[PDB]
Amino acid sequence: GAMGSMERASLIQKAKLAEQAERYEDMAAFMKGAVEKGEELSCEERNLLSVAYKNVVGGQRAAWRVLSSIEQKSNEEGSEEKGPEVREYREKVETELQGVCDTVLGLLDSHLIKEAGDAESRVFYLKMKGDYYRYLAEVATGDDKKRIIDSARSAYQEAMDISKKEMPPTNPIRLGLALNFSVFHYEIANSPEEAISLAKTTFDEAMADLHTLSEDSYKDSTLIMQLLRDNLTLWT
């Protein structure tokens, strides 16, 4: 690790600076360094880790979709042959994306998940594990595609089971997990009914628990509830 010589606190400080500067690749590298110190992450630190990689992989996924679209068009009838370049460059971006996903999955496996005993931390990491397997699934086309999809499903399901037992239906982690697992069902598992059912039930159960919340908690929960509604609107 190129970050092995830097203090944990300095890596966290720099991650925050990198965020302010919209330098998400640097932010992710700093957070990887922090994780690799081997201490558990606080809530704030878990959020820095997730923001960093979400932004990096988000950019890769957007690029991959642009390139995949061009490639798909090149394989329509009447399309002029332009050689291997579009495929090569899509493969290049794809490989980089896979690399980032493998890096995140690696941090989760060594050793964030196994050390996470509190529900909020364990659910957060298992949601991340489902998310990064989901990104792998989006680009998977070969022998392991079903196993990649199942790895996402398994991680999300474990997270769901803990979240339903240990957290209130308005908990933002529980909500965000449900949002993303619903998208997994719709976009990856070819299960739009499961996606819709999950989003609806999650929204309605949260609605019924809002009365217990402070103004600030209410704000946090309703923000994610609106994303559930936005998806339901898209799908129905």
Binding site: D131, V183, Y186, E187, D230, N231, W235
Partner: peptide
């Protein structure tokens, strides 16, 4: 594309 967090 649907929302995720």
């Amino acid at each position: 594309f649907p929302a995720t967090v």
